[PDB]
Design a protein around this ligand. Structure first.
Ligand SMILES: *[C@@H]1O[C@H](CO)[C@@H](O)[C@H](O)[C@H]1NC(C)=O
Ligand SMILES: *[C@@H]1O[C@H](CO)[C@@H](O)[C@H](O)[C@H]1NC(C)=O
Ligand SMILES: *[C@@H]1O[C@H](CO)[C@@H](O)[C@H](O)[C@H]1NC(C)=O
Ligand SMILES: *[C@@H]1O[C@H](CO)[C@@H](O)[C@H](O)[C@H]1NC(C)=O
Ligand SMILES: *[C@@H]1O[C@H](CO)[C@@H](O)[C@H](O)[C@H]1NC(C)=O
Ligand SMILES: *[C@@H]1O[C@H](CO)[C@@H](O)[C@H](O)[C@H]1NC(C)=O
Ligand SMILES: *[C@@H]1O[C@H](CO)[C@@H](O)[C@H](O)[C@H]1NC(C)=O
Ligand SMILES: *[C@@H]1O[C@H](CO)[C@@H](O)[C@H](O)[C@H]1NC(C)=O
Lengths: 208, 208, 208, 208, 208, 208, 208, 208
């Protein structure tokens, strides 16, 4: 079974030092504001489980969404800048997680299953995300084919689908639409599920 | 679920610079008239989305069928010769397309879901399709193994099945039969679905 | 859907110059009498479609079962020795074939869907099948590691399952049992489905 | 169909000389006591069919669970130390098999489908399982780079799932819970199904 | 032994339907005038033996240098335009071949071993070499990922080294310098030996 | 060091069950008469060491040249037809072996180091070598993709070079020329060294 | 020819987006002072040509040695901390480079061909090089499995050998010894040539 | 340059966790007496550097020869049974090492460069080396693919050639012959250099 009428997913059977998936956007990743939603079905959540992470050479923490024991942490700009939802994490159940960001005044937010879960102001005000980064799902940026691999602790185990990124802050109506029962045909422009190239590596598999 | 009782398809999870599928006919492709049907289910359509393309080194535009928004364009001989349907394609729904051609008087036709959608005369009159070319599905003839790859804009994302080519012009009764509820055992002679060799590349997958 | 109770099959999506599957028995193939059954679901039957073939260096035609239009030909020893059944096999439907042989005075027989279809006597009398040959399904003995070589005409396209070989002549009760609705747990000793090693090559797939 | 709501398994289509799966625990395997459960569905059982085996360089028989006809043999420390269940395993049916061990004075036991099947005392008393060995499923350590090497007789053919190892002797309530109808979310700490790395080799396949 | 003091070459042990080498320039190939030199040691010269070829999708004959028995044919723009030096090639001996082109008035030349061998005027006057094509050595453009494809007759067998391309017509002094005994460090800007990426395919080998 | 000024060879470092090299002639192998020479340097000569072998499906012994303990055996048509030299082969020394055949009257001969060593008459008179077989060096025809299969006893260990085949019986002057110190540029038409495709397999290596 | 007494090297025939070599030290790279020498023969030096680079996740610029036209730049800690020897490099000639660093007082030095070329004080005083980074030769850490992802401008083209790293500042006598004609047996402890694992990638190859 | 006139060797450029070479004898390794000689040229000799090792499942130390700083240790049967020569091995120069064993009275010996270096009596008296073990050069025991790897400490770095094993104790004259300047043509029967299959893995490569 699949969450909202989507017909494809990616399976992480296990968390190891080689498993991850890489995203290749078609247009530059420089952003003034953005939105990014995804579907998750977690098997085991640890001290810090990376869902997706965008990072550059000088700063590996440009954008980062990950799960703690019972909370969702959304990071923009750096570690000190983070927004935390309280007690809205589950295991073995499909759940939708969307979050927006605006650089004009640092408005960031988190929505879980179509309902606001967190919000703050004056986060990374005036910041701009640069180009030339590496976008990944299920793992953080680190050496590949060199060194011991990735940190086995931060990896992800479960299923992912519906990974979309927009170049603007979606309105409330759009955000509730994206999590609906017929929401798998609306895809973002920077990244879209089904049109953008996503290459599983190290053991991740496409499943239909 | 697949249409007309077919039990195999090909999946294009993404449109990238390396994804395509190649067809290897058993007999020469030299033709004076031909017919070609296919089942398609598109995910996203750009200004030009190649379904299948046949071309030699001298002329890469011998035969070509592609989608542009809600229109269907059928090309024989070159760009100047093209037949266009208006609003006969959707997204996320299985649809049957079949095109007809005759070099004796240049009669071309397009049928969508068993109904005539376009017709023309004096198209490539007296022209003979050469032999020894290359036939792909979902991509256009270009540098495949080495180079800059293909143009990602023209690639295809979705599902395809039931790709048949005949060496003659099918009659109206045969054309309506081919899109029937039990038409998946009607295969053409130049190319037949299930007997001819089709090799997905670069990320395309059989869904058998 | 699988024929009787089996939960694994092999798919030949296409007939080409590279597709086949090889069988590696655990014990010698030297035999004075044998029985062999199989499930087939043919897509397109040509003038000679090989199902399975056992051949040695000096004689590539030791044992051979194949289809020719709506007829079944069973060969032991050589071409001159063949048993033919008429109007037995159809396309796109699961059917059970099983052949019997005895070297004492050449009793050979063919059963289709549990019913006798042919029988003859004094075939290859006194002949002993040698050992050290190559056993294959869906193709005939020929060079394979030269980029091809296999005759594209004789190959097979469809699904196969339940390939068993016994070292003796099964009785009538056993033969009718092997084609029942709870027969997939009855496996032969020389070759058994799910116990013996079978390696698809060139495009054949397991469709468990 | 899979047991206890598990959504993944590993398939052994055959027992060749190269088929096995390797487990890579995160933490050391030095144990004073342990408990290890698994789901199995066997196709054919020989004189000795290995399910999982842990062994070091000096002692290849540190821990071993295997089937012999209709009996289950559990080995800790060597051949002389074995516990045998009489007539409590079948073919083609999912069955749960757990077994605990205590090093304090050698309490070992076997449970089949949540019911005690065997028990003994004073087995490998004072023994400590070393660390730095190799853990495998479906085969015994012989060598994977000798052009094969594994003895085909001992290999396994069927399906496996739910392989967990704990660092302590589970209580009776815990064991009946693990064998329950919704127990697939109860995973052990030394090895857990879905979090620990398991790499099928030589023909074994993940199936969903 | 290699000429002019070069430590590397490329070996074509044989001419088949897969052997070639591809060049990946760092800057666009759009040119108004150019020069291009190379070292050859031919084993067997045929009716037409391609040394290097540049071609686009529309026009596969943009630039070509090839050997025809004991002659050298230099092609710019198309097949109709060609310059033929005559009686100035051998087998099994290193030889240097350069040629310049100017689009302002269509001046073309050919130098063999530092001596002018041919010259013409009004060749492809006003023509501009497009950009975005494919550059190769030892073969023509189309025929990859087709199961061979390349014409076995036109391929090359021997050794090549010192392949350089400039963006301007080299003067006479520079041309005589390039074929000197200390010229292997004189590399062009569009393509340079030892700086530009040249990856052999299909059986070609780097040799030192 | 290599003989007669040849600059390439093939190394067989070991005789195994997978080592061999395959030849792909451009034109058909149907022959009325032929001549075939080769350079050989043997490391260990066993009861029968294959140099090159041509065989079809129905007759694996069409043409065969191999070495015995101290003799060279040349076979045309079948095992019963063979010509044997007596004491004219050594180990670790380059030696030229050439033999001709004529079907008009069955004249066969063997030359070793430019000197005639054997001759016979009425050998395979009226025979014609079929076409569509497999040509190999260092091994005899047998299954190769099965996984090993080749009999290690008959394999070859050493170095080979200068393998040429003509379509006619070379005269005495040509035969003495082919073994000279400036002969490595004399290549045959059916097969030529450095022009015909010869791809080693299983551990054989090109060496320069 | 090799520089002093070494018998292996690594060849970079070209600079592309994939070529580099990775080093796997046996012991941790945490250092308070170090020395590092290398043999280099450059083909083309650009605005910045990386020889070797050590960097962590938070700081890709921990240690760096690279060539800029006719100068040598040695970097410890970050960009602002650099030592620049000037006019001490050529092209196509073997040259020995070695630099030392001390964290107690920030003493850094550069030696070229056994002669001091630069010296500085108060460079990264009190700094400790972290551990758990990635060490590479000929490239900078940017990305491996993202379809290249290496800046082609910074790559290296030429030959390298004798890469050693010590855990202490070598004395003047040791430094002049390391560049001698009998020095290839003097290997460092953190990294040693011929003892430490160095696996080239993307086109680099060992040569001996 | 190689010793005694041998054309091939094996290179171990590094000490890693995956480098080794495996030997596949033709006949059983069951022995009551044997001899085994080899040519070695060590780069760095650590506390224990394995040259070759034969071991079975129940006993990984059946036969073992290795270097310990400037000593040579020869092991038959187990750890307690060892013969140690002293000051006999250096670094960077080729040296011949032979050793014989007799089970009748437990006579063991070691020769270095053709001169006796050690001798003992009553070593493994009455012992018989079992059959079905695994023979390797440069590494101790298995773990190649998924065990995690080998112990990098025991690996070997340098060059090896001339590895021969006889089934009997060679006489003194034979032993001095085997280390001569024309000794590369005499090879053992159980294992012979050039006829037996030796397959380098993980980085080792043949060199000529
Ligand atoms: C979980 O991660 C946080 C990171 O902020 C860390 O502070 C905390 O100690 C971790 N908790 C456990 C139980 O490891
Ligand atoms: C689509 O292509 C046509 C060429 O036929 C061009 O005229 C048109 O501008 C294009 N439209 C878009 C949206 O790119
Ligand atoms: C089929 O093969 C048979 C050989 O028994 C031959 O006689 C017949 O002509 C063939 N028919 C066709 C249609 O190829
Ligand atoms: C089954 O294994 C047992 C192990 O104790 C041994 O007797 C023999 O190998 C087999 N016995 C039978 C009756 O097959
Ligand atoms: C050589 O090629 C030329 C191409 O212009 C052709 O005209 C000519 O016939 C060829 N010669 C031979 C002998 O094939
Ligand atoms: C060598 O081969 C021949 C083949 O004719 C055989 O007759 C002979 O016995 C063999 N000799 C040995 C010693 O194996
Ligand atoms: C060379 O690199 C330096 C880096 O400091 C830069 O400032 C300079 O502009 C570069 N020179 C050229 C010609 O690119
Ligand atoms: C060298 O190895 C031997 C093995 O017997 C060991 O006893 C000894 O301590 C080692 N020496 C060093 C310096 O580690």
């Amino acid at each position: 079974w699949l969450p909202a009428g989507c017909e494809t997913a990616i399976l992480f059977p296990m968390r190891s030092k080689k498993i991850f998936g890489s995203v290749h956007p078609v247009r530059p990743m420089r952003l003034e504001s953005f939105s990014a939603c995804i579907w998750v079905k977690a098997t085991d959540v640890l001290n810090k489980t990376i869902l997706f992470s965008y990072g550059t050479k000088r700063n590996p923490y440009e954008i980062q969404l990950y799960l703690s024991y019972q909370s969702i942490v959304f990071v923009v700009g750096g570690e000190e800048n983070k927004l935390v939802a309280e007690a809205m994490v589950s295991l073995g159940r499909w759940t939708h997680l969307c979050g927006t960001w605006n650089s004009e005044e640092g408005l960031t937010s988190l929505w879980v299953n179509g309902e606001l879960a967190a919000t703050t102001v004056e986060m990374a005000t005036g910041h701009i995300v640069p180009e030339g980064g590496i976008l990944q799902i299920g793992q953080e940026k680190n050496g590949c084919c060199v060194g011991g691999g990735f940190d086995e602790t931060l990896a992800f185990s479960g299923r992912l689908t519906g990974f979309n990124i927009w170049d603007s802050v979606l309105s409330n109506e759009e955000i509730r639409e994206t999590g609906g029962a017929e929401s798998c045909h609306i895809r973002g422009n920077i990244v879209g599920w089904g049109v953008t190239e996503i290459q599983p590596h190290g053991g991740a598999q496409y499943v239909s």
